[PDB]
């Protein structure tokens, strides 16, 4: 009746941003609507014919770098980050032409580096922390940089995921593979940008990429992280950086690979004087 | 546009930690009793262009009142100030509004009461009716919690003006 | 050269005449100009003569002068010189018989002239009656000769009146102003006639605002037949109400007028009623956009709209029910609720609470009357039914119309802020009785009283507004929040069974709503307020668990919305439906094999990923009161080893590091986490209560640990390079781990149930780590919040930790006293905080007094006497708390009492009459007169020995009132013996009517302030004597048996 159409309304019927099998919600398979979709390898080919590249990502990657404001590009610290959607629709050429990315838990953020110092924000736009870092521009006009990462807590590392910009130059117009590549050959010599000092309180770290070959996917599964497991991130090789969600990359947890084809109380740990 | 606002209310109202906030943007939590009167020019940029408040911060304690109702003379607006916290100060008001206004014949006049940050209200909002029937202007404020901290300057700004719409607009 | 100090240099008027001009234009020289006149009245005043009589900044000069006649007169009066007193009576008059006779006194200021009125006042409050008899007669006879003296003399009557009446209390002995009271009553109507006189014959526009505005003042005294008996009520409607000049003074004593009880006078308020409302409806056209008349209004007929509102409401108050039970009136009745109606649309809040005073009065009152909805819309069996109350019947439609105003304009229902702490920390405060909350929650009142009278009116009006939003584009964010602010309001005022229908319709449409609007803008609105509305539903919620579910599932995908506020909405409403759901969250419910609880337990990660720091420490209090219903303990604790296990986790990773290497807990980004893992856990335990202990179990010891190493860092810190360092991140960050740590602990304790378990198992590692600690910090680094919490944790297991006081005032209570004992102003939240301590020891662990050393014990007593001289009004009620108390716990051990008696009775009154005499703390009256009546109540019987050291003539009684008067003697040598041995005496005679015992403190603050000399005798030392016997017969009469 009444009371179970409302439920159906309320569940099915009810988004502010309205995008497609949405991270936010649980796997559209875990939900007997709207928002939802099965259909993927359509919407990913119209979009990579789409990147014929009619937008000023130099402009706004110094906008973000410089703090200076105003389909349409996001204007602040909100919605900067390029989102997946679940894996739903399997690519029928996902081993040959994507990669996937081992995730870590920890925070999504934003890096800006710029003009001096670092900050990180969530999705939200929400400045989490403002410090010093040894990412070109992060300090010690030019040369600012713009990180895609997800910060885990224990290891006080942000784990990188994606480059926007680096050293000033505008990298959103460029294929995942480059992006990707360009990532960890640049990384890995920065002084010790992946070390801990007082110039460099949190250490940068890439993540690294791997073939979605049927072995392949076997093997990464198999394989020991410096970090607890979150989920699997699959990018297609050539799509380019555009922040918002898109079916240009999957999102899938763990245990879902799997099934898509492959004498009274205390004492101190710290025994200092009582 | 200079304006003369005289402070009144009672010991430990929290007039001179109010109008320091104002100034410096500091919280004193310490209550050192003000000496019969400091002036504190308090600059406000508006649409329009930027106001003054030359404010008197005058002493609530009756050893230190000083020149006491000489200080009003030539007034131009005024904050009555309470606390919340303590029934005493608010009905000693109408003795503040008194001594005000035989200065004073009619100039504009907020009544504030302070301290409504502190969880432990003793003055009722249902008690706090004086206002109405000497046509003052009322409201609830913060000095530390900055709740409606410019309230009672942007109304005395909008009534010594003549403009209703008139907004701080900060620089 | 400004050195020069006012003595007798003989000197001129031309140098006072210009410090006073740089006291009122100068900047930091204007604090010397100030400091030296206000320093200059020390010796006397031989210079007031001088200065008035010779003079930009004369009148500044003279107003000054006039300034020290005045001390002269209040203070000197009765033991100045008969001659001087005449003299001076005399030079007044006539200063003011030639200022005021003079056409440019206009913009010599009415300051030189009020000043100079009430200097006249002052003298005739010293002397009106007994050396002034004719005053009266005079004034009256001089003002129906000049005009001009007519005028100022209705301004001298007025003063007179506010002095007498008004004023009187605390400026005046409770004997001399019943005595001015009824003097002034006693000649009054020679001057009602001087008033009628000029009003019918006026036509001088100034004099009759002042006879106008004098009137007002009488209005607040004047016998009644003065008021009721006389063509004052129509001189008034018809004369002066009807002219723009006179129309606001002439309402305002309207509604004096009409505050007053109808009882005897039914007639003259009908009629009142009756005038006004013709006047009115002259004044104001009865379709005359208020709202817009008073925004586009001035300062004269915005006074008059407000007036008028304070009219109406105070009438149809006072007199409501006399304008319903006569029929001729009924419709001057109608015609008044619809001006309040017009006025109650204009937009300025203060006019606002005025009529929703009334609507809610109204509401209320027909809600007495009956609270039930009448029948179905037909009146069964043809006849027109009689369910309808007979005063309801007069209002069905202008209810309607009220319910219309609730919903229009229905006030937040919260009031949110954004609030920067002691530290960088920027979180969101939650005001709790702020105006603005009051006026929502009358105005939810209001609404809520006519939802019972009529629920159907209240959902039609309410639907009908809702459709204007998703067709009728009555469309805007402001509105949608407006409706939905009302909808949420009347929550529980509607059967269940309407309630569910209601509710169905009305989300139903706002989730179309919601898909039909494009943007995120008109998304993120309409979304937050269905979320807001099912909020404040958990009884429809509660009832349909599928319902329930989808809510928080759909609560969860919000928590990822980027849209600014949406996040916080998400989180707000969860915490609100854990609280009020939580059962059914821990309870299999039906159509599912496991309680709901678990999913999220196995999913806080994928949940929490995009919120902020706030917005995770909320959501796991949120999931805190879900975990708190589930009673089974082995459940439960399962339950809270899962829910904290993220915490748990960096915690355990932290304090292993810090094994290794205590540098660690100096790392600025670990500190940073360690509040925040702090910061989780207080929440949790604040959601969770007692079954806690589990979790704060398994990591006090090392949280101690911890707190003391970030505690001896911030100490060192200090002493090396002073209070500065406490400004910058890491330090501030360090304040919060230790803020955090205290919080938790006094949060877990407050809400235990196992005191004798607390005892032995949390207390005891606190004195360590935490009280020597406090000890052991240089006095900058000592956290204020050790006090309080050891005054919680005091309040709550009170004799299971007597017996650990001492070592407790061992470690923090000479230290902490020694912070707060040179002055008055330094360290204010230790001594705020060092006094709630005492007080929770003094109440609930006093045998801890009558275990330590009698010198400990007098340290003690030592430092209540010094809490209760504090300034901070805080403070010192406080001290006079503990110091009731204390008495109080004394008279129950009589071993001691006696010995406390003999040793510290006589003090501790010396130290209370030093405070009461002290203008400085008259904040404290209501405690000191509390006081003072018990000891002295207690002198009757409670002392058994001897005090003097000889028993028989200086009787217990005689000692004290002895002693007392002989303390004020030598403290207050200008009292003759007969003020003091009058208030001595009556200390006695009143020490068992409290409210009299003020009053009787009161009058001797008077006294005390005014030098009556030896041969004044106008005390009426025969008149309170009676009084005060009067008191003392009904002692027995009060307490006997
Ligand atoms: N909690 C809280 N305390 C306040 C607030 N405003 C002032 N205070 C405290 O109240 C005391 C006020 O001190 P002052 O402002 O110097 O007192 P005053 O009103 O100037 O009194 P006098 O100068 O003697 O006439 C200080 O201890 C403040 O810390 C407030 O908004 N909230
Ligand atoms: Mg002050
Ligand atoms: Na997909």
Redesign the interface.
């Known amino acids: 009746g009444?009371?179970?159409?409302?439920?159906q309304?309320?569940?099915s019927?009810?988004?502010?941003?309205?995008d497609l099998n949405?991270?936010?919600?649980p796997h559209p398979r875990l939900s007997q609507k709207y928002s939802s979709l099965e259909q993927s390898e359509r919407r990913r080919r119209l979009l990579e014919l789409q990147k014929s590249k009619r937008l000023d990502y130099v402009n706004h990657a110094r906008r973000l770098a410089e703090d200076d404001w105003t389909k349409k590009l996001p204007k602040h610290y909100?919605?900067q980050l390029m989102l997946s959607e679940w894996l739903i629709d399997v690519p029928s050429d996902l081993g040959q032409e994507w990669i996937v990315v081992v995730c870590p838990?920890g925070?999504?953020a934003l890096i800006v580096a710029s003009r001096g110092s670092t900050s990180a924000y969530?999705?939200?736009?929400?400045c989490?922390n403002r410090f010093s870092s040894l990412l070109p521009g992060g300090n010690r006009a030019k040369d600012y940089t713009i990180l895609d990462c997800i910060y885990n807590?224990?290891n006080?590392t942000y784990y990188v995921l994606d480059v926007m910009c680096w050293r000033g130059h505008p990298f959103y117009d460029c294929q995942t593979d480059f992006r990707f590549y360009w990532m960890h050959s640049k990384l890995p010599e920065e002084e010790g940008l992946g070390e801990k000092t007082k110039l460099n309180?949190?250490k940068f770290v890439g993540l690294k990429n791997f073939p979605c070959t049927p072995e392949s996917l076997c093997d990464v599964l198999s394989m020991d992280f410096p970090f607890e497991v979150?989920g699997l991130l699959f990018y297609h090789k050539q799509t380019h950086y555009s922040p918002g969600s898109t079916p240009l990359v999957g999102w899938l947890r763990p245990y879902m690979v799997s099934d898509v084809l492959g004498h009274?109380?205390?004492?101190?740990?710290?025994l200092?004087?009582? | 546009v200079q304006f003369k606002l005289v402070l009144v209310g009672d010991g430990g109202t929290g007039k001179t930690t109010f109008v320091k906030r104002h100034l410096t943007g500091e919280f004193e939590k310490k209550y050192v009793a003000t000496l019969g009167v400091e002036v504190h020019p308090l600059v406000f940029h508006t649409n329009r262009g930027p106001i003054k408040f030359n404010v008197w911060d005058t002493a609530g304690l009756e050893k230190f009142g000083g020149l006491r109702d000489g200080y009003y003379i030539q007034a131009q607006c005024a904050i009555i100030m309470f606390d919340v916290t303590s029934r005493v100060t608010y009905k000693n008001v109408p003795n503040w509004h008194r001594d005000l206004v035989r200065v004073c014949e009619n100039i504009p006049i907020v009544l504030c009461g302070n301290k409504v940050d502190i969880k432990d209200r003793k003055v009722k909002a249902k008690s706090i009716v004086f206002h109405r029937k000497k046509n003052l202007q009322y409201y609830d404020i913060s000095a530390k919690s900055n709740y409606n901290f410019e309230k009672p300057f942007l109304w005395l700004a909008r009534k010594l003006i003549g403009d209703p719409n008139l907004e701080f607009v900060a620089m | 050269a400004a050195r020069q100090l006012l003595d007798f240099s003989q000197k001129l008027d031309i140098n006072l005449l210009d410090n006073v001009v740089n006291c009122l234009y100068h900047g930091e020289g204007a604090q010397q100009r100030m400091a030296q006149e206000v320093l200059t009245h020390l010796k006397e005043h031989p210079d007031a003569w001088t200065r008035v009589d010779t003079i930009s900044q004369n009148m500044n000069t003279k107003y000054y002068g006039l300034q020290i006649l005045e001390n002269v007169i209040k203070t000197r009066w009765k033991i100045l010189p008969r001659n001087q007193c005449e003299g001076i009576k005399k030079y007044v008059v006539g200063l003011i018989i030639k200022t005021s006779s003079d056409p440019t006194c206009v913009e010599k200021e009415k300051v030189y002239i009020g000043k100079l009125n009430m200097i006249l006042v002052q003298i005739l409050k010293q002397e009106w009656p007994k050396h002034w008899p004719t005053f009266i007669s005079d004034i009256v006879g001089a003002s129906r000769t000049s005009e001009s003296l007519c005028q100022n003399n209705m301004v001298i009557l007025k003063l007179l009146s506010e002095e007498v009446f008004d004023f009187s209390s605390g400026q005046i002995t409770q004997v001399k102003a019943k005595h001015l009271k009824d003097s002034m009553c006693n000649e009054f109507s020679q001057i009602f006639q001087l008033c009628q006189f000029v009003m019918e014959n006026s036509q001088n526009a100034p004099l009759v605002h002042a006879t106008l505005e004098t009137l007002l003042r009488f209005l607040n005294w004047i016998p009644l037949g003065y008021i009721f008996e006389t063509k004052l009520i129509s001189t008034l409607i018809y004369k002066f109400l009807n002219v723009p000049m006179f129309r606001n003074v002439s309402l305002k004593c309207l509604t004096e007028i009409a505050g007053v009880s109808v009882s005897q006078y039914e007639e003259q308020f009908e009629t009142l009623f009756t005038l006004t409302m013709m006047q009115l409806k002259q004044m104001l056209p009865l379709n005359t956009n208020i709202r817009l008349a008073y925004s586009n209004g001035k300062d004269d007929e915005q006074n008059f709209i407000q007036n008028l509102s304070l009219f109406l409401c105070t009438f149809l108050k006072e007199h409501g029910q006399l304008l319903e039970k006569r029929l001729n009136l009924r419709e001057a009745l109608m015609e008044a609720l619809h001006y309040m109606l017009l006025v109650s649309e204009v937009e300025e809040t203060e006019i606002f609470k005025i009529c929703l005073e009334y609507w809610n009065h109204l509401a209320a009152e027909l809600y007495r009357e009956s609270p039930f909805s009448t029948s179905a819309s037909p009146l069964l069996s043809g006849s027109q039914h009689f369910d309808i109350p007979p005063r309801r019947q007069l209002y069905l439609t202008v209810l309607s119309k009220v319910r219309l105003l609730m919903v229009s304009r229905m006030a937040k229902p919260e009031e949110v802020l954004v609030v920067e702490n002691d530290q960088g920390e920027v979180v969101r405060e939650f005001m709790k009785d702020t105006d603005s909350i009051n006026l929502y929650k009358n105005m939810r009142e209001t609404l809520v009283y006519l939802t019972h009278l009529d629920y159907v009116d209240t959902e039609i009006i309410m639907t009908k507004k809702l459709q204007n939003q998703v067709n009728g584009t009555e469309w805007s964010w402001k509105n949608l929040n407006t409706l939905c602010w009302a909808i949420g309001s009347i929550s529980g005022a509607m059967h269940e069974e309407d309630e569910k229908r209601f509710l169905?319709t009305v989300?139903?449409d706002l989730?179309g709503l919601?898909?039909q609007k494009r943007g995120?803008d008109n998304?993120?609105i309409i979304?937050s307020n269905?979320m807001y509305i099912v909020g404040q539903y958990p009884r429809f919620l509660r009832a349909?668990w599928?319902?329930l579910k989808?809510?928080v599932?759909?609560l969860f995908?919000?928590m990822?919305?980027?849209?600014?506020g949406?996040?916080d909405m998400a989180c707000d409403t969860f915490i609100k439906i854990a609280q009020k759901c939580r059962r059914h969250f821990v309870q299999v419910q039906v159509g599912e094999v496991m309680p709901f609880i678990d999913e999220i337990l196995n999913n806080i990660?994928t949940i929490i990923?995009?919120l902020?720091?706030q917005q995770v420490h909320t959501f796991y209090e949120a999931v805190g009161y879900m975990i708190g219903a589930q009673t089974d303990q082995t459940v439960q604790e399962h339950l809270i080893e899962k829910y904290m296990l993220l915490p748990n986790?960096?915690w355990?990773?932290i304090?292993?590091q810090?094994?290794k290497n205590?540098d660690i807990l100096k790392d600025?980004?670990?500190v940073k986490?360690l509040g925040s893992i702090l910061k989780t856990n207080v929440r949790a335990c604040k959601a969770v209560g007692h079954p806690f202990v589990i979790q704060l179990?398994?990591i006090?010891?090392?949280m101690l640990?911890?707190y003391?190493?970030l505690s001896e860092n911030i100490s060192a810190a200090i002493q090396a390079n002073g209070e500065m360092v406490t400004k910058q991140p890491l330090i501030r960050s360090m304040r919060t781990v230790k803020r955090e740590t205290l919080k938790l602990i006094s949060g877990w304790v407050s809400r235990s149930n196992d005191p004798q378990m607390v005892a032995?198992?949390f207390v005891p590692?606190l004195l360590?780590?935490v009280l020597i600690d406090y000890q052991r910090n240089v006095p900058a680094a000592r956290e204020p919040e050790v006090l309080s919490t050891m005054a919680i944790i005091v309040n709550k297991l009170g004799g299971h930790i007597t017996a650990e006081i001492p070592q407790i005032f061992d470690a923090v209570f000479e230290c902490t006293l020694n912070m707060i004992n040179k002055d008055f102003e330094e360290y204010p939240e230790h001594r705020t905080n060092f006094f709630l301590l005492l007080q929770a020891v003094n109440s609930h662990c006093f045998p801890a007094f009558l275990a330590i050393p009698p010198a400990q014990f007098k340290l003690v007593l030592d430092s209540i006497i010094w809490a209760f001289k504090h300034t901070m009004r805080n403070v010192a009620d406080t001290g006079l708390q503990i110091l009731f108390t204390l008495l109080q716990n004394v008279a129950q051990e009589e071993a001691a009492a006696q010995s406390f008696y003999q040793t510290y009775f006589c003090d501790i009154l010396q130290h209370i009459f030093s405070v009461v005499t002290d203008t400085s703390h008259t904040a404290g009256l209501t405690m000191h007169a509390s006081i003072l009546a018990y000891m002295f109540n207690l002198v009757e019987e409670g002392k058994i020995s001897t005090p003097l050291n000889p028993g028989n003539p200086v009787n217990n009684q005689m000692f004290i009132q002895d002693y007392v008067a002989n303390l004020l003697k030598s403290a207050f040598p200008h009292l003759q013996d007969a003020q003091v041995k009058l208030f001595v005496t009556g200390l006695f005679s009143l020490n068992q009517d409290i409210p009299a015992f003020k009053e009787h403190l009161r009058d001797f603050l008077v006294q005390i302030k005014e030098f009556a000399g030896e041969d004044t005798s106008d005390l009426f030392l025969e008149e309170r004597e009676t009084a005060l016997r009067q008191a003392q017969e009904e002692k027995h009469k009060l307490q006997m048996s």
């Open positions: 009444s009371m179970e159409e409302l439920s309304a309320l569940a019927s009810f988004s502010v941003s309205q949405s991270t936010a919600a909100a919605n838990v925070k999504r969530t999705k939200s736009g929400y989490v807590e224990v006080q309180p949190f979150d009274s109380p205390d004492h101190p740990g710290c200092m004087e009582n | 169905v989300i139903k989730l919601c898909e995120k998304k993120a979304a269905i349909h599928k319902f989808t809510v599932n759909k995908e919000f990822h919305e980027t849209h600014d949406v996040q990660n990923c995009d902020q720091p986790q960096v355990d990773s304090i292993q810090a094994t205590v600025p980004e670990t986490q179990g398994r006090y010891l090392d640990n911890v003391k190493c032995e198992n590692p360590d780590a």
